[PDB]
Design a protein around this nucleic acid. Sequence first.
DNA 1: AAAC
DNA 2: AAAC
DNA 3: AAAC
DNA 4: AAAC
Lengths: 426, 426, 36, 36
Amino acid sequence: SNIQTGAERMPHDLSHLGFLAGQIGRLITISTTPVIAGDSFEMDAVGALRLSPLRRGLAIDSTVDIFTFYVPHRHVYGEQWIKFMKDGVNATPLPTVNTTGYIDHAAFLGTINPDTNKIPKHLFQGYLNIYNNYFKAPWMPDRTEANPNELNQDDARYGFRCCHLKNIWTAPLPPETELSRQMTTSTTSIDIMGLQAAYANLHTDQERDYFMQRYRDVISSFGGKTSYDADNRPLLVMRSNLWASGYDVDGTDQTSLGQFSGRVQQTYKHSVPRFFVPEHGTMFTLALVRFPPTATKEIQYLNAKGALTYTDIAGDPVLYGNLPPREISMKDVFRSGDSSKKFKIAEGQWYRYAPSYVSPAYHLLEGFPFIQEPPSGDLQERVLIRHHDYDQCFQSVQLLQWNSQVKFNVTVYRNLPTTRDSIMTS
Amino acid sequence: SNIQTGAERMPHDLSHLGFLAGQIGRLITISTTPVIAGDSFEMDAVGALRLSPLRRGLAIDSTVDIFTFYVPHRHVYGEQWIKFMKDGVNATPLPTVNTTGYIDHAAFLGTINPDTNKIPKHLFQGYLNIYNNYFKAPWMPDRTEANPNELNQDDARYGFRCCHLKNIWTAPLPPETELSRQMTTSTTSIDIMGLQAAYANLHTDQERDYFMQRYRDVISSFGGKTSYDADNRPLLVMRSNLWASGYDVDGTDQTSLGQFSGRVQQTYKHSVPRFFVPEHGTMFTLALVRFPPTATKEIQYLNAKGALTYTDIAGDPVLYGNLPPREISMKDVFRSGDSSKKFKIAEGQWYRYAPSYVSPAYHLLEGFPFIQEPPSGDLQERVLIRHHDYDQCFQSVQLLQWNSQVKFNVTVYRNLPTTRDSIMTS
Amino acid sequence: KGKKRSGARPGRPQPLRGTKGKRKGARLWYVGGQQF
Amino acid sequence: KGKKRSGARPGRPQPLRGTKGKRKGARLWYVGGQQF
DNA sequence: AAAC
DNA sequence: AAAC
DNA sequence: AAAC
DNA sequence: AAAC
């Protein structure tokens, strides 16, 4: 017998509908398309973004980010994948990670949990890589779970927590920033030349602390470049950002005349231009919905830290341009701030930033997506968004905090035989 | 104190002379330049290639290949390197491989052996990567030595053995090529549909055997591409190939009038166009000198394998286009061929190739670079060149079989401060 | 690599009308004949 | 990536004349003054 | 990483 | 029935 | 890897 | 002495 040895590349329509729902600061997978080496991929996601009904009228738009990343399988199975491709037909089948027995416990990967409880490891691992390289704060430790079953029900069902949009309190300098540096000197002399050197080393430290915690950044610093293969990072193909809005619904009965309900319907469109897939992998598309971090009790630093010194009030450039990072507490910027919770700020930061003001009349008023009490906890707990901080904002519904109905138009120019080349023996 | 935090990229002249010598089929390092992330590298190697004086006049030109590869350090220290860059100034110093106590025992890396006996592991490892990805036959096992001290004195001093230029005997199909394939059938029926499938699987096998033993090749087959980072391969930047020649010296004394000595002087030029170094690494430049594999006893297959069948003599395209690889012995193509040494050839190969003819009058005549007896040994020993097969060709000299005097013009556009920025405290 | 964001598609939402891509290609279903 | 070979530099060999590149740049040696 |  |  |  |  002679067999159908070739195939000619033709457009494959892998389009599908997406019925989505998530929480406010959690990263969730909304679509995934497995890709073959050599195919060309393009997508047009067009749908509507809705928030759960809110308790009063619209006050603030939320921002939406949609991302499409490419994760080669090699990146996920390493050596094992390489060998699989080489071994070919009799390669040992690929490893499968374990989920918790519930229908929504793999939802973070945008999938229904199979009854067996396992999924392809590349689906779980790709997600972790995406999170650890673009979403955790550079200084937090990577998420290193071996199987989805190690996750809480909120991480598993809704996706991992993302950081807030940058603030003085939301984006402090990295935890271990040094506020001083000693040079061991001799008892009655200092080496003028060693001192010089001392400064050169701290420099190098300081840069890694503030801008280069990641290997890829250290190289760019040298003016070199590093491939996504060099540090195994998911490649960001496309990203769309938008503000979702809508309209208020006027109540009209005897008791609710003078009352409104904000309806957020936002038409959006996520377009990924054609992309050449160099090796077999998954194409992950994720969504993140967030509100600006408006707390109902943030104070202006100068208004809440006692008596004002010359250094704090004068705006003297020689001072600000030359002294160490300032360690501050949650109490210097918040009404119920824990004085025990510290953070390092740049000197003069208070003159480079302005907090939003929420009159005290709004403090526990439901229907506003404001953070009601200052985040309590370690630096990490304060920068990671907590979806419950938004519970009193919406009407209670089964579709969490936001829901979307999208049409994923996706075309892949792949080269596999026709469905009938496939079902015909000859 | 304020320190010299920047530098401006300016041309660095890293030019140097090279006084070289090697054996005939061994790959040797002739120059190495350590590169920093972000520099631009360019080189103009211009010198003369000489062979040791030969015993009679010139008869055949040898061919010369000069190669320049780039090997990123990450490729060599992996994870350890990544961490080193991140750790910065207090990174743990990099590992150093061990050499044998002799002055020429690191010569294969184009260097004099330090008295301590160790060298940077990247220098030794880079060489192995280069060898294993472009020089061994795809089907031989990689060279996996941990330290240079595990090598024989000929590998260590002269470089590793390379394969001969392709021949019927020098380039047989890979050792494990299957000559048949069984499909387990039932006792009195065969599944017409399984058979079909059987053929699809063998196909996939066959391709990996003949053209895709390397992962990178399997992907190109899909029409995808793989970065040099994907499989860790040294990147080939430039390659020059040439035929070295010279002239005969006429003897003129009473006894040597009628006698000649071939003098091979070959001016050559190896030019590497500018190259952007993406990450810190070494730039390796190696030379390989080889002669076409002319044996003094190869016979034409049809003239040396008995009685001729229709399949062997007719050139019937339907036969050649359809039967398994033919297993042959060293005796079917050589006068003192070991009948016990087999090899798989393509059917009809004898009509696609013609051996060179050396009249028997030349058999043990010294001064001709001919292979005098057919290579004896396993497939691997026969394809790897053996420099001693050329000993009776040259006058015996201290500079081995070939010597070169080159001027490596190399310019690097790097960014490090000036030699005085460097020696001035302020 | 990723870039400009655009869900700013100014419009009232439209009910999802059809899960079949934008550009189709060869035939995918074989059921024995025509089936409406 | 590598390519065309060229040692075919048609010429009689010339003695190596000088180990100093093609394009130089800043000063490298400081010995206290001029030294021939 | 609004960088000698 | 994206068909020698 | 002179490839449906 | 590839120098504020």
